Write an enzyme that holds these catalytic residues in place. Structure first.
Site, PDB file in Angstrom:
ATOM      1  N   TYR B 412      36.199  37.429  33.820  1.00  0.00           N
ATOM      2  CA  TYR B 412      35.347  37.564  34.964  1.00  0.00           C
ATOM      3  C   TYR B 412      35.422  38.906  35.673  1.00  0.00           C
ATOM      4  O   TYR B 412      36.234  39.725  35.347  1.00  0.00           O
ATOM      5  CB  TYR B 412      35.477  36.363  35.880  1.00  0.00           C
ATOM      6  CG  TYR B 412      36.600  36.380  36.816  1.00  0.00           C
ATOM      7  CD1 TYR B 412      37.666  37.198  36.633  1.00  0.00           C
ATOM      8  CD2 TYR B 412      36.589  35.577  37.894  1.00  0.00           C
ATOM      9  CE1 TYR B 412      38.700  37.214  37.506  1.00  0.00           C
ATOM     10  CE2 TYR B 412      37.605  35.595  38.791  1.00  0.00           C
ATOM     11  CZ  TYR B 412      38.657  36.414  38.580  1.00  0.00           C
ATOM     12  OH  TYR B 412      39.637  36.418  39.491  1.00  0.00           O
ATOM     13  N   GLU B 413      34.533  39.094  36.632  1.00  0.00           N
ATOM     14  CA  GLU B 413      34.465  40.291  37.405  1.00  0.00           C
ATOM     15  C   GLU B 413      34.227  41.436  36.477  1.00  0.00           C
ATOM     16  O   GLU B 413      34.744  42.489  36.664  1.00  0.00           O
ATOM     17  CB  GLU B 413      35.749  40.479  38.167  1.00  0.00           C
ATOM     18  CG  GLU B 413      35.647  41.521  39.251  1.00  0.00           C
ATOM     19  CD  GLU B 413      34.583  41.189  40.276  1.00  0.00           C
ATOM     20  OE1 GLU B 413      34.744  40.194  40.991  1.00  0.00           O
ATOM     21  OE2 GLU B 413      33.591  41.911  40.340  1.00  0.00           O
ATOM     22  N   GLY B 414      33.427  41.163  35.461  1.00  0.00           N
ATOM     23  CA  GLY B 414      33.104  42.086  34.406  1.00  0.00           C
ATOM     24  C   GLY B 414      34.091  41.972  33.261  1.00  0.00           C
ATOM     25  O   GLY B 414      35.197  42.390  33.375  1.00  0.00           O
TER      26      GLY B 414
END
Lengths: 562, 560
Positions: B412-414
């Site tokens: 997540y968060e890229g």
């Protein structure tokens, strides 16, 4: 979520690379392409259509223990019948007790398919095959006639009972005991932990192999003996008699393979029979380690294969980061499948050909097959899960299970670190390093013979460079082995992986040479072979250079003590 | 199963290595040794004594959904009250809305301890910190005055609502609709997935930040705006009014962080208000990326730290393989921590000192911090688990959870592959590579000053060799990136790990130097600094050589 058996790749390995139909080992002449094709497609049908749909079921349901009875996931029993009823649980076992005596190389190829489709399910028959194999090797004629026929067909299952809660890595501490009885048997008391398939209701009887100490024997490991301890005592006609003093008293909640029970086994004056020689239980285990290691190596490869298929599907529903990820997975899987099956072929030559050179080389290589394939295989399952993004972290997606199941293969059957110490601290010293030298001659021999084709130089030169690193690593150990063993043993793990990369690089050399020759002769599909040459180039330039990193970590000496 | 805050290691980083006393950034004069020590001990006590015993509870209980209402793990809410009450959720936030305006460096140092003790718990305040920051940066005064005081104290929580079932990786194919309403608000309709802390009862209200397209606007991402969608509408009097059309319709069953609820959020004419400018929602989030990335890299480091502590405990209950394993973990963790805190310091100098050179440097490094620390961090937790043997695979042992929780920080968060492509396809090109050059200048400069004669040659010579590999890698991109772009970008992931190793080598270089200095000055515990030196030698000789493998995988160029 789906498993498609890689029968084309396996068929290529058997005939284009390992050349099975012309191998002079006993039993190999029957492995004609139409035969092996038929067997592989049938096993892959059972894999994809029966075993794999139950994989997520086993992760979701686990096993339940109710008053000494263990119920496995719903559906596992019926799939177990199908597998048994098809003869699949003794493809490679002797005809005398109901097996089909096919080569171990072929049992291993089929086993990869079953294990990839559903690892936790396949361990029920996998563990039985290991226990049956130990009785075949060490049993008396009476023991083999009593136990093997039902174990070959998995009417009876079996498993090993080795370690105890207080032991740890030293089984020479075990407190389980075997008191001789006037009727030839022994009474076994003690408690064993981490017993795979220790108890379940999918078979009428369960045959345990238990390590215990006869009172009076040598201290430690030198006093451990091995025993056949049936769950149900067997009567003279082969029908089942009285429930023996062995019970699953607890099932573990584990990180994965929930479909396969893991128990604490309690032995309370259970009736058992000496297997092998008195006080030489660990000797008996030693003889079984080559196949146990290949079997666990196969599990790690198989997890990478199924996870890679499903990551490749997600990707297709090309991106340069995604393509690099998938090519790392694919170049490892196909190189490691070749390494595994070459290993299995050598077991056949050692065992069926009585070849001591094959036996020495395979015993050098099996810790590498186990450690390298399970480490890299796990890493690939993680990378396959990464292809799914956020969906990869959701359990209904199926990818988390592939990593979690793969994780146990790095741990059990001798933890990867133990395999590494065995490779450096025991295997390199066998017979003056004869088999180490033989592997080098093997690699040098292939480089010089295949190098007569200029088209092979692109593959021989990276392998030559990688082989010098393995050669530079084996030296560090020749010196500091005795002047500073702590430095030698600290580099063991890296040596295992350096060796692993050279083994896959050799196999990629062999597959490059075979696909070149099939392109030159117009044999097989030309895209398949062109794809092997590209995947080979990828391994040589992108994965094989890891040998330099492992060498640097080795030639750095002993670590700081602190 | 146990967590002991590494306050000694953090303290040494702040004062001996990052040298906060010499730092002219506003607020840094207040970071005296006695001040930081007191802060870290208090945060350490909360971490080890309150949050960590709940870590396993979070894993075994998870979260339960019953028609829109979510029960968190037993004990989480009381721990959340205690953390809120102590001012810990607005440590580094502006005093105007209730914060304490401490340096981001100190909030990050505190945050690693909370997150290591209990990652799933700490995400409730961490996501609110991220949602409150986006309102502080882009909100009207009315929006800041309505939402920030309650969010700073975590009486209200916050979270981000971005991706949808058929979108990610492509947020431009977003179907969420925001229909302009007569009264100046918007009607939000759509479905959002993977919403961390989407629904729970630890706060009176949850402020959702939602990306959605205003109809008649631009066609893809260019039509995406950001909106404030509260779970309960806020009336003028500042209390809660009507229940908004916002609903967690399903809690995800995930691999780990069970204690952090993850929902499918359904929006049905939800009342929302535009945050920032129409059609500039994605652009609004660009400004949050440096700190989001650092916070998630922090999560990866923090999982490796707690796993290593417990593997250490178990190894103590000599072995050469085990020693190597533990030293790989230790040398990564301590170098990663120095890298992480050096990044937080540079955020401070950029944001508070308006140091544009620190802004450029840190913006270059944050994708390395996120991707490298979470990849290596996960690998270390797997190795920590390996130390337990068979017991490591039994859930009761606790080591499994450490790896499963760490796994999400790579995603997540890229995802880390997106971090790598951004590093190579966007960061290397900033201002004609000016910051890239400054990083090389920084490594060269350290090497010349620390010298190649004294006791530092041990550390500077391997750093110089690794630096050269990074330069040859950068030469490959600066010269092939637009000749054959698929070639360059295939090696982006290797470039991110190559860069990460050089950053850790520089940090070990700086740590070896500051510990030689401290030994000669009779300062601190000498065994601490002698261990620092031996750990640095290990990193330089056992982990830094990995730059050679990453270079080889870059120079092989394009893949079939």
């Amino acid at each position: 979520t789906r498993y498609t058996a890689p029968t084309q790749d396996i068929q290529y390995l058997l005939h284009d690379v390992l050349d099975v139909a012309n191998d002079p080992t006993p039993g190999y002449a029957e492995l004609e392409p139409d035969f092996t094709s038929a067997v592989l497609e049938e096993a892959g049908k059972i894999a994809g259509e029966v075993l794999h749909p139950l994989n997520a079921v086993g992760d979701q349901e686990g096993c339940v223990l109710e008053n000494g009875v263990v119920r496995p996931p719903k559906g596992f029993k019926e799939a177990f019948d199908q597998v048994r009823e098809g003869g699949w649980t003794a493809l490679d076992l002797p005809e005398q007790y109901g097996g089909q005596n096919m080569p171990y190389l072929l049992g291993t190829a089929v086993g990869e398919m079953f294990s990839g489709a559903n690892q936790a399910f396949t361990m029920y028959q996998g563990l039985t095959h290991g226990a049956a194999s130990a009785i075949l090797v060490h049993g008396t004629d009476q023991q083999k006639d009593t136990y093997l026929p039902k174990m070959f067909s998995c009417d009876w299952t079996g498993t090993m009972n080795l370690t105890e809660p207080h032991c740890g890595t030293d089984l020479g501490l075990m407190r389980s005991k075997a008191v001789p009885q006037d009727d030839g048997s022994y009474a076994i008391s003690g408690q064993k932990i981490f017993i795979s398939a220790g108890e379940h209701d999918m078979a009428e009887n369960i045959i345990h192999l238990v390590l215990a100490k006869i009172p009076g024997g040598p201290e430690g490991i030198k006093g451990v003996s091995l025993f056949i301890v049936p769950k149900f005592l067997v009567k003279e006609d082969g029908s089942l008699g009285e429930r023996n003093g062995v019970k699953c008293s607890k099932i573990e909640e584990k990180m994965g393979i929930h479909g396969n029970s893991t128990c604490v086994m309690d032995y309370d004056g259970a009736k058992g029979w000496l297997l092998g020689e008195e006080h030489k239980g660990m000797r008996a285990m030693f003889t079984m380690m080559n196949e146990a290691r290949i079997g666990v190596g196969m599990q790690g490869l198989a997890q990478a294969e199924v996870a890679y298929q499903n990551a490749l599907d997600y990707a297709r529903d090309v991106h340069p980061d995604i393509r690099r990820n998938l090519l790392d997975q694919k170049s490892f899987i196909e190189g490691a499948r070749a390494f595994l099956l070459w290993g299995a072929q050598m077991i056949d030559r050692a065992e069926r050909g009585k070849d001591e050179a094959a036996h020495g080389m395979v015993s050098l290589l099996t810790p590498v097959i186990k450690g390298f394939l399970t480490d890299e295989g796990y890493d690939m399952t993680v990378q396959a899960q990464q292809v799914y993004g956020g969906h990869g972290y959701i359990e209904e997606t199926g990818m988390s299970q592939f990593t979690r199941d793969a994780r146990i293969a790095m741990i059990y059957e001798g933890a990867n670190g133990v395999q590494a110490l065995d490779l450096v601290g025991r295997k390199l010293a066998q017979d003056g390093g004869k088999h180490v030298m033989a592997f080098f001659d093997l690699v040098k021999g292939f480089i010089k013979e295949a190098g007569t084709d200029g088209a092979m130089a692109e593959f021989t030169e990276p392998l030559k460079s990688a082989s010098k690193d393995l050669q530079s690593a084996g030296m560090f150990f020749m010196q500091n082995g005795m002047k500073n063993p702590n430095a030698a043993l600290a580099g063991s793990y890296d040596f295992m992986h350096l060796f692993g990369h050279v083994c896959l690089g050799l196999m990629w050399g062999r597959m490059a040479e075979a696909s070149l020759k099939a392109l030159a002769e117009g044999r097989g599909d030309a895209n398949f072979h062109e794809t092997k040459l590209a995947t080979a180039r990828f391994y040589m330039t992108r994965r094989l250079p890891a040998t330099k990193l492992h060498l640097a970590r080795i030639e750095s000496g002993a670590d700081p003590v602190m």
